[PDB]
Amino acid sequence: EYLQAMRNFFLDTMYDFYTSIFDQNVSFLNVQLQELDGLTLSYKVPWPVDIVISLECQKIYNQVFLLLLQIKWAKYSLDVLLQIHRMFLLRVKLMHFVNSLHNYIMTRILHSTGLEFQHQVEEAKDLDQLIKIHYRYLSTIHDRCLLREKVSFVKEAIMKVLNLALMFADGWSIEKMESDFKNCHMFLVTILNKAFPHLESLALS
Amino acid sequence: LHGLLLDQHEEQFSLRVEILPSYIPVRVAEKILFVGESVQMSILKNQEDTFAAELHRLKQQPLFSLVDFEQVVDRIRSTVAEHLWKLMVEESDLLGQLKIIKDFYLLGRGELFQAFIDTAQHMLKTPPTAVTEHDVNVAFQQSAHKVLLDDDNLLPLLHLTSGWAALGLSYKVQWPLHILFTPAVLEKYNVVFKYLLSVRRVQAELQHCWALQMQRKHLKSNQTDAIKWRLRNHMAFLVDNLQYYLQVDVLESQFSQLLHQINSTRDFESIRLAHDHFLSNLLAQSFILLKPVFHCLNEILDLCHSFCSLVSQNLGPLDERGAAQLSILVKGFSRQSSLLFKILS
Amino acid sequence: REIITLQLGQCGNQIGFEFWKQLCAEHGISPEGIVEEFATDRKDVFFYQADDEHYIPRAVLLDLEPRVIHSILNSPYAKLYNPENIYLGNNWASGFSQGEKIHEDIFDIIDREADGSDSLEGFVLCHSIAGGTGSGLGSYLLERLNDRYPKKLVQTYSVFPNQDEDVVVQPYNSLLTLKRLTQNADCVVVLDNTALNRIATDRLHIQNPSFSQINQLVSTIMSASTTTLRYPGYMNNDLIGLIASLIPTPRLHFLMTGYTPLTTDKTTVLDVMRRLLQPKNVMVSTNHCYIAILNIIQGEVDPTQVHKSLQRIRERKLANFIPWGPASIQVALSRKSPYLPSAHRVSGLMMANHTSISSLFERTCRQYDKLRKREAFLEQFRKEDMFKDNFDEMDTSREIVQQLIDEYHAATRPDYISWG
Amino acid sequence: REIITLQLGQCGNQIGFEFWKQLCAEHGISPEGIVEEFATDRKDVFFYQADDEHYIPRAVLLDLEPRVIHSILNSPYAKLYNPENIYLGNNWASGFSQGEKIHEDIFDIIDREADGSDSLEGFVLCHSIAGGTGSGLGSYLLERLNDRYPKKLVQTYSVFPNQDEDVVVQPYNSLLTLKRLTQNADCVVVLDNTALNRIATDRLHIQNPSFSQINQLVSTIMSASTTTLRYPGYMNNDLIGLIASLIPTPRLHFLMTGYTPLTTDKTTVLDVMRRLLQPKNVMVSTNHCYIAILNIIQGEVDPTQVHKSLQRIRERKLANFIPWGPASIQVALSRKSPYLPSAHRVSGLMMANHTSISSLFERTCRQYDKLRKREAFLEQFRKEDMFKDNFDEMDTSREIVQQLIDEYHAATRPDYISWG
Predict the structure, then answer these.
(1) Which residue of chain C has the CA closest to D53?
(2) How far is it, in rounded angstroms, from Cα D33 to Cα D80?
C-alpha cells in the first residue's frame, strides 16, 4: 500500500494541489501537501519499510515528479488562454506537441509497467527478494524514462520547447517561435529515424 | 537413468574413441547417448526402477553376451523415444507448427509474398545491409497487417545478409519442446525458400508486363503486325509456368508423405529418419543440387529478367534498337530450350 | 474543481433530471441525499459536500411557465437535491423578453449558489435549441453569464428537437441562439434528434418511447464525458483542460459526438477504434474533414495493445488530419463505473471537432434564408415586432454564421495559413 | 487482391444474388453479415472487411426499370450486403440511351465503392446477352469502365437467354454487345442456355424450374472459378494471372466452359480427365480446334497420379494443340470447400479457349444477316432510329466480327505464322 501511495504522491485531488503551485515558502508547501522546479516534498519511511524501500528510490520518484510538473506547466499554460492570427497557428502546433509528449511518458511507460508491477510485487515471497524485484523495476523504468540515456540528443528538444511555454505566455516574435519549432522538431525526427525498438512508440509524428 | 553427463573422469559433449567400445557395435553406442540426453528434457523416471532391476541383473552375471545386452539397451531406447513422441505431437502441437513452416517456407500462403513484392521494389539493387535490412522487416510487418493476423508474426522474421537473393528468413522454434529443428534444418528451408521466391519474383514481372489486352490492343489499332517482338511474351511465360506447375507436385508429394508417415510411427527416432528423407528428396527433385541442368534453368531465369525489362518500357510496339536485344534473346532461348529436351532422353 | 449545473427549458430539465437519477444510481448516494457505504471516488465535482453528511447535488432548476417540472417535483429524485435553487413563451423574442423581466431573482439564485460553493470551475447549461420556453430565455441569460462572469467557463449541452421534419419559427430561433452560442459560449455540444431517433428506431423496436430512451443515451454520454473528473484518473480533471485541446480557434468549438455500442442488451480496443471512426457509429450525422479528434474509452480491457492499436490504425491509413496543423487523435482511457449492470462493459465515446456540422449549419441557414425570402412563415407575433422592429439581429446572426461557414471551409482547406 | 462485383440486368442480378447466397452458405458468415466461428480462408477478395466485425460483401446492384430486384430486396440476403451501393428498355439502343441519361450518379456509386476499397484488382460484370434491360446499358457502361479505368481489369459473365428458339431484335443486340465485348473487355465467359437447358432436362426431371437450377449451376461454376483465390492455394490468386495464360491474342479471349458431374445427387483424376475432354461433359456446345485448355479440379483425391494421368492421357492420343504454338493443357488442383453437403466431392471444370464458339458467333451472324436482308424484323422503334439513323454501328460490329471469324479460322490453321 505504501509503495502504491508513493507513486501516487510523487506524480482530482492533485489538481487542486497543482493549481496552488501554478499561482519559496517551505511551510506553505508542507501544509498544502498534507492537505516546476525547486520543491521540498517528502514523507518519512518508517523503519520496517525503510529496510526494503531504499533511499535512492525516493530520488527516482522525485525525478519523475519534477519532470511531470514541467510537462503539466507547459500543457496547462497553453490550456489557460482563450502575426495576429499566427498565434493560433503557434498554439495547435505546440498544444499537440506537448499532448503527444505527455501521452508517451505516461501510457507507454508509467501505466504499462506499473499495472504490471502491482502483479509483480504480489508474487514476491520474502523481505529479501522484494528488494530485488523492486530494484529491477526502478533501474529500468529510470532507463525507459528520458533522464539518463540520450539526454542531450532527444531531451534538449523537450527542454527548449519549455521556453516556448514561457514566451507564448508572455505574448498572450511570433515567427521566431515556429522557426525554432520546425527546426528542433525535424532535428528530433532526423535523430529518431534510427528506429531502440521502444523508440518507435513515439517515432510517429 | 538420471541423465547424468560427464560420468567419465578422463578414463551435448561428443563421442570419443576412448569411450567408444568396438566389441559392442557403434549403433547401440549412439542409442546410449540418445537415452542419456532425453532424461534432462520424460516418463523414463516412472519405469526407472524396472530398468534398474535389469541392469542389476546384468551386474550379477559372470559371463557376458552381446545378444542379450543389445536387446536391453534397444528396449530402453524404444520406451524413451515413445515418451518424446507422445508429448511433442500432442502437447506442443508439432503438426500445427509444420503447417506454419510449410506456409511461410514452401510459400504455401500467397498474400504476404505477393504484397511484399508489390510494396517493395528497391531490393533489385545491391544492399548496404543496414537500411535495406530494416526496410524488409518493416515491409513484411506492414503487409501482414492490412487484413487480419494480429496473432503470429513473432516466429517468422527476415534476415538480409542483390537484395532479393541474399535475403533470408530468420525463424524461431520452441527449443525445449522441439529438437527436430536446429539451425541446419531451417538453413535447408532457407535455401528452398529463396529459390521459390526467385520464381515468384519473375512471375510478378510476367503478369505486370502483360498489358497486351488491357491497353496495347484496346482503343488502339497499334503498330502491331508491322513492328512487334513476334509475341515471344506468350512463349517465355509457358516454359516457366509449366516447370512451376511441376514444382507444385514436387512439393505436394513430399508434404503428403510427411503427414502420412508421422501418424504411423510412435517413436521420435523413426520420425528423425522420415524428416531426413523428406528434406533430401525435396532438394534433388527441385534440382537445387548444383547440376548443369540447374544452371540451364538459372540461365533461363536471367534471360527472363532481361526480356521483361525491355517489354516493360516498350509499351506500344516500338523499335528502339530493341531488335538487337531480341536477337540475343531468341538465340539463347532456342539453344537452352533444346537442352531442356535432352535431359528426358 | 467544483462545477455547477444549470438546467433550463422543459427538455433541458428532463435530460438533467435523467442525468441526476443516473448519477444517483451510479454513485453511493440514496434517493435521500445521504452518502452510503458504497460511495470512494471524488464527489465534489457535481455534489456539494453538505453539512447533513449528505452529498447534495448542485442542480439549479430554472423554468418559464412550467408543465413537466411539476412531474419532476413529485418524485424521490427532486428531494434528492434541494439546496433551495428550485424555481417556478414559444418564441425566441418572447422567451428573451420574459427572461428580461425576471432576470434579477433567478440571477440571485445563481449568485447564492455561486458563493455557496468553495470553488468554481464552470457553469454547464442544459438546453434545447428552439425548445420554446428554453429558447430566448437561455440565450439572454447565457449573455448575462458571459457578461457577469468572465473568469469562469460556460459549457452548453444542446439538442435540436425535430421528429424527422418541423416548426417554421424554429430556424429563426436556432439562428439567433446560435449567434449567442458562438459569442457567449466556450464549448457547445450539439446533437441531432433526427439521427439519434433513426438509430434508436433501428436498434430496437422503440418508436413511441423514443424520447425516454434518448434521455438515457444523453445521460450516459454526459456521465461518460465527466467520468474522468468524477472518478480518480490522470488528466483533465478540470473542465478547461478537457475543453482546451479540441479547439484550435474559438469559433470552431462545436463538437461532434460518437458512441460505440449500438445496443447494450469481450473485445480489444483495436476493434472499437476501427468501429468508431466509421459513420455507422456516429449518432449525430466537398468531403468535410476533422480538425481534431478526442476519444474516451471506458471498459474492462487490458490497456497495453493501445499502442499496438495505434500502430495498426496508423498504417491501415484511414483518416488524415488538417493541412496546416500537425494534429493528432487524442486518447484517454477510463473505467466503466460499477453499480449499473451492463453487458459488454466496453463502451467508447468520441469528442471530435468536425467541419461536417458546418453543412448542417448551412442547412439551417438555407431554411432560414428561404423563410426570410417568402415572409409568410415568420408568423408575425407582437413580441417579435416589439423586440426588434427592424429584425437586424437576424442579419447580424446571419453575417456571423456566414463568416463561420467561410471559416469552416477555409480551415478545411490550407487557407488557414491565409485568412477566410 | 480485392475484386469488386458489378451486377446489372434482371438475369445478371438473379445469378449474382444466387452466387452471393452460395458464398453465404459456403463461408463462415451469417445472413446478417457478421463473421462466424466457422470462417479461416481469405475473405477479402469479394467481401469488404467492414468495421462492424462484419465481412460485408462487395455487391454493386444496378438496374433499369426493376421488377425482380424488389423480390431480391425482401429477403435476408439483401441485408447480407448493404454498403450503400443498392440502386433502383427492351432494346439495345433504348437501354443505351437510358444508360446515357443516368450514367453520372451510378458512376458515382462505382467511384464510391472504388475508393472505398483498400486495393483494386478487377471489376467483374454479371450480364445477360440481349436480356432487355441489361443490354445496351451494359454495353455503354462497359465502354465507360474501359474508358475511365485503363489500369484495371474487366471480366464479363454473360449468358444467352434462349428457350431453344427467339427474339427478332436479339441478333442485333447480340451483335452490338459483342462488338463492345470484343473491344472493351479483357475476358468474356459465354454460356448457352439452350445446351444447358437440354442437359438439365436430360439429367433430372426439371423442366419448369429449369432457370432456378441453372442459377445453381452458374453459381457453382463462378465459385469454382474463384475458389483458388478465396481459399489459400498456390497460383493465380489475382484475376490477371488466371486470365493471362488462356489468351494468345486479345480477340480470342472467349472461353468455353466445362463441368464434370452431370448430376450430384470415389474416382481418380484419370477418369474425370478422360471424361471432361469429351463433349458429353461440355455444357456449352471444318473441325474446330482448341487453342489452349485450362483445367481446375476440386475434389477429395490423393494428387500424385496426376503426373501418371498426364502420362496416360498423353499416350492415349486424343487431342492435339495448335500448329504454330507449342501449347499445353494447363492444370490446377484445389479442394472442394466445406459447409455444403455434396455426394461425390470430385468436381471438375475446364476453362478453355476454343474456336468452336466462332461457329456459334457465325450462327448469330447468319441470323443477323438474314434479318438485315429482309428488314421486317428490326421492328422499327423510334429509339433505334434516334440512336443511329444510318445503322452503321451494325456495319462496324459486322466487319469487326467478320475479322474475328477470319482470325478464328486462321488461328485454327497454320496461317498464324501469316496474317488473317
Answers:
(1) C271
(2) 5
Q: Which helix (H) or strand (E) holds C328?
A: none
Chain C within 8 Å of B119 (Cβ-Cβ)? no
All partners of chain B with 3 or more CB pairs under 8 angstroms: C, D
CB-based contact C312 B146, cutoff 8 Å = no
Helix ranges (H only) for B26-131 are 26-40, 48-60, 66-90, 94-105, 111-118
Closest of C285, C295, C280, C290 to residue C347, by C-alpha: C295
Q: Give dist(CA C246, CA A42) in Å, integer.
A: 36
In what helix (H) or strand (E) does residue A15 lie, and over which residues does it extend? helix A14-22
Q: Is B48 helix (H, G, I), strand (E, B) or coil?
A: helix
Interface check for D166 against chain C (CB to CB < 8 A): the answer is: no
For residues D93-110, one letter each, b for 16 or more C-beta atoms within 10 angstroms of the residue's C-beta and e for the rest, the string is bbbbbbbeeeeeebeebb
Whether the CB-CB separation of D109 and D54 falls below 8 Å is answered with no
List of residues 6+ apart from C321 with CB closer than 8 A:
C290, C291, C292, C293, C327, C328
Cell of C122: 464552470
Is-contact A29 A40, C-beta < 8 A?
yes
D240–B207 CB contact, under 8 Å: yes
For residue A88, count other CB atoms closer than 10 A to its CB. 17
Cell of B339: 537442352
Put simply, the answer to whether B145 touches C316 (Cβ < 8 Å) is yes
Nearest residue of C to residue A15 by CA position? C237
Three cell numbers, residue B61: 552375471
Q: Do the Cβ atoms of C271 and D53 come within 8 Å?
A: yes
C136 carries a ligand binding annotation: yes
**B297: nearest Cα among B204, B196, B168, B186:** B196
CB D98 within 8 A of CB D137: yes
Measured distance CA(D66)–CA(D76) in Å, rounded? 19
Q: Strands B167-170 and B157-160: what pairing? A: antiparallel
C280 touches chain D (CB under 8 A): yes
CA distance readout (Å), B47 to B69, B75, B83, B265, D319: 19, 12, 11, 22, 67
The verdict on a CB contact (< 8 Å) between B145 and C270 is no
Q: Scan for cell 444466387, then name that residue.
A: D18
Least CA distance to C316: which residue of chain B?
A: B146
Q: Chains touching chain C at 3 or more Cβ pairs under 8 angstroms?
A: A, B, D
- Chain D residues near residue C278 by CB distance under 8 angstroms: 51
CA nearest A31: which of A21, D292, C1? A21
CB D169 within 8 A of CB D378: yes
Beta strand pairing status for D47-49 and D55-57?
A: antiparallel
Q: Residue B54 burial (CB < 10 Å; 0-12/13-18/19+)?
A: middle
Task: Fill in the DSSP letter of residue C54.
Answer: B
* D 27-86 residues with CB < 8 A to C: 51-53
Q: Which residues of C288-321 are buried (b: 16+ CB within 10 A; e: fewer)?
A: ebbbbbbbbbbbebeebebbebbbbbeebeeeeb
The CA distance from C129 to C11, in Å, is 10
The 8-class DSSP code of residue D249 comes to B
Sequential DSSP letters for D257-284: EEES-S------HHHHHHHHTSTTS-S-
DSSP code at position C253: -
